[PDB]
Structures are given as structure tokens and as C-alpha cells.
Design a protein around this nucleic acid. Structure first.
Lengths: 158, 167, 244, 161
RNA sequence: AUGGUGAA
RNA sequence: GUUCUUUGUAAAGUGCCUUCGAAGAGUCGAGUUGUUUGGGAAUGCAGCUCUAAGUGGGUGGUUCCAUCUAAAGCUAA
RNA sequence: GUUUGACCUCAAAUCAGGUAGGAGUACCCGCUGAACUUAAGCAUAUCAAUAAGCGGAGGAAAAGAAACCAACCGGGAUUGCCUUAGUAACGGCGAGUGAAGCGGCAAAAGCUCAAAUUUGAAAUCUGGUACCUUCGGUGCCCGAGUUGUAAUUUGGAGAGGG
């Protein structure tokens, strides 16, 4: 059978909780290439003739890992079907050691749809507007009981 | 001699697109082998395949959940040169315009429905109104015939004697 | 067959409660106005709002003059079960069917009733050309078929049918009905019943690949054009109903 | 060989980060990348190699609509006789007294009407029921026009030649 | 010894 | 030698103060089997078998001191 | 939801954009690789770590900026020559085999990545198309890429700030 570290996946966010997380994440889609290009062209045209940081989800594996271990990230999403499993084996344990809540979601393809990329294998959010801060906090609190308390014996099931 | 199946296999085109190309080229049926070889080069087929690929791209964009990308793909998108060869001279076009006028008149009276875009009906009505205005200005009509299926209107454009039915 | 989710039923309940609260207040205000209880109300008189094309709004005081009007169903609110108070009105006016329309005559008493159900439908004054085109290109007519049954509401196939059904008020052709509808004729009610529904063509009618984007664009434009004000004193919103 | 894992290390949550790298100014101020891109676009606009969206609005909604403004045929007095494969369209011939007010001799009798109704499609060369209507309003509506013309369109190019 | 040739 | 752009709140040169401030793993190496060998201390090479750590590791040193940081790569003379 | 869409793996195309076979072979970089022949002898010693055999490049190639050499008051890339030296060292210590620092000369350019979050904006690049001033310059599109393209940097440190 698989080692105890493996099979920690296959226990993931449920349809309701996953749908809620996607709905919350869908409100922070990062600016795509076309949107950024048109915005910059409009700004240049305005300048030629004569705002705070843009809140967005963090999805880069290196960027997400750097955010973790610094307590900046408030929530982290983990892809379960990552082909190089070694890239993701340490992420759950590292987050638990750092105390950062995380929720595993099935499908790297599904995860990537929220950032206009084919696959990202990871997703996280640090900045959040006031209108969504309460929703993010409630989702984080719910995820605790949904996952951590339901799989306290994840070390079993070789 | 080849058949419709062979032509479809060689052209690698859909049945509806094959019928559209045949209509735009008047390839009456078995099928004319000597004409299919000439049909092998057709920018209309290139446009059709490009539109088919764009359809898949738009479906992918919609599935990925990006309205802006879908709008950009949709915005970023003819028979003018086809008529050049199938109507060698104006008299031939005038002679063959009977079917076109009849179809436009029939469609102008068709109520809007899910199976026919309202824009098509509006365009047909506008074309019919333009034709009626042109006929009235030139007064080229010579005879009027009333029938149970409509009024068999006719015109003498350059002596053609075309007969267009008004539903 | 399909399982019912808790969230959907909860949303339906909340929307129904909000609509019922709005409707009770609207009915109370209308009853007080009919009683001339002008002592304490938000507005003594009433207004009719008009939206026209870039987009600008127009507001004018209600005028006590009857006029021909056309009303079409807007298929909403999305998740509100129609209350019996409004359900009865919709059924009586036979506009419950989605995308269906019918012509009515504006009156002093009709306007308060329209105000209550204004969000559920779209109203406006169609042009004479539009009315003629709709009448000559659409319109159901219930009749007894050949001998036995009366399911044939298809179309006004023959003028002789109109002569046979009524025969008395001079309604012998479709143009007579058009004139009686455009003009404030006595036969307006008679022909109005004769043509209970007006089954106008619906939207794109599908999803497809590009059709999905078209439907999304229509839905988002509806919010920028139509809006559920929900105000008990909301003026009636008129639009270019002829745009179809 | 097969025993549960132990959380001896992960049991205690970390209190503070593991690095003290000072935060760069860009994390609290717009970075130079956006300004550089904006200035590059401004330079492109000034050099004339790119156009602002304001003019593109006109180019998309006030240009490219000028279509069909050319003589498609021009001077032409020749026919397709070079290749005789252009079969004649076979346009329908003139009417055959199928009027709303035809001669009284062609007024279909009840027996003739029954005989015509007995015949099915594809055997109705006389595809009209002649009748006399002294009043225009008495003319009944025709719903078979669409079907007949659709059949004509099908037969136009769906027949061997 | 290494690299090759053809065959009662 | 004669000229056009010189642009953009851009790059980068230096004196002083504050806070951070990484390093190549079936790899070194122990044993074994053949090879290289002028090679007394393998000096190396290939398979077999287990596999090490960062106040550490390699090569030497007379009690202990002297010098670098392999297991990534490029470059005319 | 009995449909539909995201992907991931591999095929299909006399589709577009691309490269290799071989020849030559004195020298270069590696693999395999013997015998005649010798001290009185053939397993080390020696022909020979050679010829032949095999694979891959250029006008030169390899190597080249130390986990180096040394023990002195220290030198500071690789390479070629003289010297060190027929010395240290090896071998029926004999016959014979056979190195290197330091010194002098020729020429001395040193560099680029992994290992820290750009995150207040994959800003990177190939390909197609449309133009020009064509070993290339630009508008637009797609794709590659987040399992990582973009600021420095290989310890002589370096970076965030004043």
C-alpha cells in the first residue's frame, strides 16, 4: 500500500465547500493579458492627450511557497492530481507546521480555470476587500472543521 | 467519375459546408469529377474551417470562465468574389435574379422565430423595400397577375421579363 | 426527479417574503390613495418613467387620457414564486405565459394595477406601423375548428372567419381589427378577447457555443436596461417595446 | 513496517516567519514595470506606429462599413458559352390561369376537387385549386407557399444533370 | 596477431 | 570627421549608517571484482552494495595547525 | 447531469517552420584493441595503455578560472618549451622503467546558472499575419510558459533601506 504521507490526498473539499471557495475565488480573477494591455493602452492615450494595489489570488508555486512560512497567505489550495507528487507531499505538512489553513481540491485543470491558466497546481489569497474579508474568514473557519477535524487520523490508511 | 462520398473525403469538409460550397459553385450531381478538382482551391473553405476552429476556441473560453476573453474572440472575426465567376455578365445575373427575388419576398413575410434570426428577416424586408422603391422609381413593371398563392409580379429589366412572386 | 437543494429553497423563500412585503405595502398605499388619504403619503400624484437611447431617462406626470398599450412577460423575478395576489391578476390578464403579450387600454383604474405588476412585465406604447406588422404577422384566434373541437388557435387564415365569428360590428378583415385596436373603438374589448394571447418570438432559444455568449450579453444588458426597483412608489417604466 | 506517522514536529504551530528580509518599496508603491510599459506605449503612439483606442473606435464603428461601393461586373458582354456546363436555371413558366378570379369554366367542381384531393404529392402537376373570388377579402390564406418554394430550391441542385 | 576475400 | 533621437520621475558609477544575507545526493566515502599503472599513500577509471553533513566537507601538517569549497556550465592568445 | 466543458497521455497529416546520415581523417576527443618482438621467462615489467577496428568535431582541438601547489617572509587560470631530471620513485634495486612544485621564457579576459516572493499588474519568448529602411525594425493574433519566461550574483559576496 501507499506510505502514510500518501493518501493524505483523496480527502478534499466537498462540492458545497468547493463551490463556495470557487465563487469566492472567482471574484479575484487576476487581470488577463488582454485586459492589462487595453488598460495600459488607455492609460497611455490619456497621458499622451493630457488606486491601491490590485487584489488578486496568488497561484505561482514558488510565489505561494514564499508566501507560506511568512504567515502572509490566509488560505491555500492544493491540487491532488499533480504528476510530480514530490512537489506537493511537503506542502500540507509545511502549512500545518506554519498553521496556515489549506484545502485540497480535486483537479489541477479545475484549479487553473480560476487564474486563466491551464494548470497551476496551487492557489492562495493574501489581500481581500472588506466586502469579501468576512466571507473569506467564514470559509477559512468552516474549512477547519470540514477537513482538519474530519481527518485527524489521516496518518492511518497506509 | 467520383461520388459525393469521395468529394467529401477529399475536401475534408462537413456535409452542410459541402452543400454550401456546391450551391456557391452550382456543382449539380454522382458528382462532376472535373469540377471537384477545381473546387480543391477555395478560400470559402478556408474561412469555414477557420470559423469552425474559432467555435472551439470560444467554447474553451466560455468553459474557462472568462467573459472578456470570449468577447475579444467574438469581436475579432464573403460571397463578393464568388459572384465574379458564376455570373459572367449583368444580363445573366438579371435573368437568374428571379429565384433570389422570390426567396427574399417569401422570407420578408416570415415571422421571427427561434429557427430564423430576426436580423435575417429584417434584412430581407429591407431588401424587398429597396427593390420595390427601385421598381416604382423606374416604373419597369408591365404586367400584374393575382393568384391564390400571391400576386405573380413581373418586371422587364432590360427586357428580361423576370417574374417575381409577391406573397 | 431532480433533488432540491437547501440553498435554492431558502433563496426562493427569502425572495418570496421580500416580494410579499413589497406587495402588501403597495396594496395598502394604493387603497389609501383611492380613499383620498393624502394626509401622509410619499407622493400625492404618480409618474411614468421612460428609458430611451448614450442612455437617458425621462419622467412625466401621469395624464388622465386612455391610450393603447402592449405588455409582454419578462420572465422574472428569477427566484420568486408569484404570490396569489399577483398570480390572480396575471392569470386574469393571461400574461402568465413566458414571452406572451396582449394589448390593453390604459385607464385611471388600470394604472394602479399595472404599478403593482410593473416589474413582472414590460409596457410601452407601440407605434402604428409596429402594431400593424404584429397584427398582420402574428396573433392567435380561438375558433371551433371544422365541426367538433377548438384547439386551432394558429393564425387568422381567412377573413371570412372573422365575418362568421362576429358578423355584426363590421369586423370583416384584419385591418378592421387593426383600426379598432389603434383607435379607441368599442370593439377593442371584443377583438381583444378574440386574440387573447400574442405569442411573440422568444430570445435566442438555446445555448450553443456563441449563443451562450449572446445569452450572457442579453442578460447583462437587461440589468443595465431593466431594474427591479422594488419601491412601492416606483414610477412605471416605459421602453421602446417596438424593438423586436 | 506499516505504522502510523507521527506529528512530533508539526504539532507546534510556528509563531513568527523564518526570514527577516526587509520589504521592498515596490510592495507598497506602484512598481516601475507599469510606468515603463505606459511610457513605451506613449512612445509608440507618438511615433505613429500604434493608434490610441479613441481613433480605433471610429475605425471600427465609422470605418469598414463602406462596402459594395465598386462595380462588381463592370464592362462585360460575354456569357458562359466558353464552358457549356452552365445548365439553364429552368425558371418556372408563366401562370396557367391559376388566378383568384379565373374563367368560370375552370371552377373546380366537387367531384374534380375530390379527385384532386385524392392525388398525393409528386403527382399534382396541376398544383392549384382554381376558384373564383369576386371579393379580395374572400381570398383564403396560403400556407403551402413556403413548402413549394423549398421543394423548388431542393430540386434546383439536388437532381442529376 | 589485426583488417579483408570466396568457396567440394 | 558631419548629423537625427538625445528621455524616463530610467539605468548605473562612488564615501558613510541600519536590516537581511542561499551554495550543486544513488553524491563523497567503506568493502569487493577487472583495468591503468614508472606511480613506494589508488593516482584514477567501470560494475557490484550501503550510504553520510552543514559552526560542515576535501588535501596536507606537527601535540594540533596551513589552503579551498567538488558532485552545474561558457570562454581567442 | 442518460448531455456538456476543462484538462493530462499518445497517435494521425505527399500540413508550415527545422536538423543528422556521407566524404575527408596528419593532428584532436572517447571505446575496443592484440602479436612478432625482450631480460635466461612471460601475469604484473616491455613492444603497448601502440598499429589495425569503432563513434564525433575544428582550423587548430581538449583543458581553462581550484574541494590547486605547498610548509616558505608563501604562489594564485589553462597551455607549449628549457630547467628541475634521467632526479624523486618503480623493477629477480641489477638489466631496465619513469613523474611533479618551485625557477626562466611565449601569451594573460575572465565569466554565466541552481540555491532569497516582482507580486502594487508573465511585465518574457517562438510562430502566423500586415507594413519598412531586410544577417533585421514595428501594429495585431495564437501558442510556449506559473511544475517559472522577467533586476543583480557565484563568495572579490550580494540584496532591501537611509
Amino acid at each position: 500500500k501507499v506510505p502514510p504521507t500518501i493518501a493524505q490526498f483523496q480527502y478534499t473539499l466537498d462540492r458545497n465547500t468547493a463551490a463556495e471557495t470557487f465563487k469566492l475565488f472567482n471574484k479575484y480573477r487576476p487581470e488577463t493579458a488582454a485586459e492589462k494591455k487595453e488598460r495600459l493602452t488607455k492609460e497611455a492615450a490619456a497621458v499622451a492627450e493630457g488606486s491601491p494595489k490590485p487584489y488578486a489570488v496568488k497561484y505561482g508555486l514558488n510565489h505561494v511557497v514564499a508566501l507560506i512560512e511568512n504567515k502572509k497567505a490566509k488560505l491555500v489550495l492544493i491540487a491532488n492530481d499533480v504528476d510530480p507528487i514530490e512537489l506537493v507531499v511537503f506542502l500540507p505538512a509545511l502549512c500545518k507546521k506554519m498553521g496556515v489553513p489549506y484545502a485540497i481540491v480535486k483537479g489541477k485543470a479545475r484549479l487553473g480555470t480560476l487564474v486563466n491558466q491551464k494548470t497551476s497546481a496551487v492557489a492562495a489569497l493574501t489581500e481581500v476587500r472588506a466586502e469579501d474579508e468576512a466571507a473569506l474568514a467564514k470559509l477559512v473557519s468552516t474549512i477547519d472543521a470540514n477537513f482538519a477535524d474530519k481527518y485527524d487520523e489521516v496518518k492511518k490508511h497506509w | 467519375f467520383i461520388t459525393r462520398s469521395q468529394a467529401v473525403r477529399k475536401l475534408q469538409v462537413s456535409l452542410a459546408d459541402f452543400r454550401r460550397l456546391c450551391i456557391f459553385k452550382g456543382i449539380y450531381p454522382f458528382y462532376y469529377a472535373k469540377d471537384i478538382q477545381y473546387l480543391m482551391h477555395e478560400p470559402v473553405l478556408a474561412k469555414f474551417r477557420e470559423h469552425k476552429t474559432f467555435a472551439r476556441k470560444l467554447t474553451r473560453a466560455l468553459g474557462r470562465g472568462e467573459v472578456s476573453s470570449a468577447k475579444r474572440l467574438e469581436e475579432n472575426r464573403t460571397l463578393d468574389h464568388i459572384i465574379k465567376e458564376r455570373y459572367p455578365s449583368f444580363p445573366d445575373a438579371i435573368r437568374d435574379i428571379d429565384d433570389a427575388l422570390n426567396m427574399l419576398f417569401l422570407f420578408s413575410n416570415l415571422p421571427s422565430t427561434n429557427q430564423v434570426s430576426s436580423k435575417i428577416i429584417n434584412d430581407a424586408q429591407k431588401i424587398c423595400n429597396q427593390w420595390l422603391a427601385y421598381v416604382a422609381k423606374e416604373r419597369l413593371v408591365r404586367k400584374v397577375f393575382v393568384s391564390i398563392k400571391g400576386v405573380y409580379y413581373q418586371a422587364n429589366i432590360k427586357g428580361e421579363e423576370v417574374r417575381w412572386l409577391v406573397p | 426527479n431532480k433533488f432540491v437543494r437547501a440553498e435554492s429553497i431558502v433563496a426562493k423563500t427569502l425572495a418570496t417574503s421580500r416580494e410579499k412585503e413589497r406587495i402588501k405595502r403597495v396594496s395598502i398605499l394604493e387603497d389609501k390613495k383611492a380613499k383620498n388619504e393624502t394626509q401622509h403619503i410619499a407622493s400625492g400624484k404618480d409618474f411614468i418613467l421612460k428609458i430611451t437611447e448614450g442612455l437617458i431617462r425621462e419622467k412625466t406626470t401621469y395624464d388622465g387620457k386612455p391610450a393603447l398599450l402592449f405588455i409582454v412577460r419578462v420572465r422574472g423575478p428569477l427566484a420568486v414564486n408569484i404570490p396569489n395576489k399577483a398570480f390572480k391578476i396575471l392569470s386574469l390578464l393571461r400574461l402568465v405565459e413566458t414571452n406572451t403579450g396582449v394589448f390593453v387600454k390604459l385607464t385611471k383604474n388600470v394604472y394602479p394595477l399595472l404599478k403593482v405588476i410593473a416589474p413582472y412585465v414590460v409596457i410601452g406604447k407601440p407605434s402604428l406601423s409596429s402594431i400593424r406588422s404584429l397584427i398582420q404577422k402574428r396573433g392567435r384566434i380561438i375558433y371551433k375548428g371544422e365541426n367538433e373541437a377548438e384547439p386551432h388557435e394558429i393564425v387568422l387564415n381567412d377573413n371570412n372567419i372573422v365575418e362568421e365569428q362576429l358578423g355584426d360590428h363590421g369586423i370583416i378583415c384584419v385591418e378592421d381589427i387593426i383600426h379598432e385596436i389603434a383607435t379607441m373603438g368599442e370593439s377593442f374589448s371584443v377583438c381583444n378577447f378574440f386574440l387573447q394571447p400574442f405569442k411573440l418570438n422568444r430570445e435566442v432559444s438555446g445555448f450553443g457555443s456563441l449563443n451562450r455568449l449572446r445569452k450572457i450579453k442579453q442578460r447583462e444588458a437587461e440589468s443595465r436596461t431593466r431594474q427591479f426597483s422594488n419601491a412601492a412608489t416606483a414610477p412605471v417604466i416605459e421602453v421602446d417595446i417596438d424593438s423586436l | 513496517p506499516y505504522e502510523p506517522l507521527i506529528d512530533w514536529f508539526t504539532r507546534h504551530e510556528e509563531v513568527m516567519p523564518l526570514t527577516a528580509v526587509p520589504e521592498p518599496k515596490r510592495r507598497f508603491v506602484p512598481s516601475k514595470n507599469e510606468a515603463k510599459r505606459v511610457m513605451k506605449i506613449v512612445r509608440a503612439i507618438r511615433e505613429g506606429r500604434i493608434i490610441p483606442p479613441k481613433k480605433l473606435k471610429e475605425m471600427k464603428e465609422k470605418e469598414k462599413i463602406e462596402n459594395y461601393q465598386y462595380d462588381l461586373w463592370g464592362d462585360s458582354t460575354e456569357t458562359n458559352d466558353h464552358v457549356m456546363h452552365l445548365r439553364a436555371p429552368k425558371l418556372p413558366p408563366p401562370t396557367n390561369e391559376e388566378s383568384y378570379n379565373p374563367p368560370e369554366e375552370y371552377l373546380l367542381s366537387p367531384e374534380e376537387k375530390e379527385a384532386w384531393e385524392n392525388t398525393e404529392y409528386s403527382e399534382r402537376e396541376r398544383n392549384f385549386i382554381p376558384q373564383k373570388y369576386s371579393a379580395l377579402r374572400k381570398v383564403p390564406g396560403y400556407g403551402e407557399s413556403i413548402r413549394e418554394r423549398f421543394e423548388r430550391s431542393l430540386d434546383l441542385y439536388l437532381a442529376p444533370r
